[PDB]
Design a protein around this ligand. Sequence first.
Ligand SMILES: Nc1nc2c(ncn2[C@@H]2O[C@H](CO)[C@@H](O)[C@H]2OP(=O)(O)O)c(=O)[nH]1
Ligand SMILES: [Ca+2]
Length: 104
Amino acid sequence: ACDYTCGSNCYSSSDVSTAQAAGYKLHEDGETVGSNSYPHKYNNWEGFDFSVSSPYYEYPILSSGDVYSGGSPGADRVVFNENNQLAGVITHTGASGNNFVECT
Ligand SMILES: Nc1nc2c(ncn2[C@@H]2O[C@H](CO)[C@@H](O)[C@H]2OP(=O)(O)O)c(=O)[nH]1
Ligand SMILES: [Ca+2]
């Protein structure tokens, strides 16, 4: 079963946890990754009511299972905060333009 379903992608708790650990780690060293410099800030234009506190940072989660280290970031992201908390999992899939919809 899927703990998180991002359109076509099936992500498990373990998947989310791995990406998230990679992002908070970069964020902690003050280092980026890719041409879009992940992780960066998630502004929250979508206006999601996260059960966690701002500010937010995003980091790509790959359907491939591997951790992002460059190349296409895909459509799915993991959102965590300064305390290393999971805000959620979002995707551009089924979302107009660069908008975001949440993974089910
Ligand atoms: N849709 C959306 N994009 C955001 C937000 N905060 C930062 N971004 C980034 O700004 C871009 C829009 O110009 C988005 O594609 C996204 O980059 P990512 O694709 O790396 O997530 C936000 O709250 N919503
Ligand atoms: Ca997996």
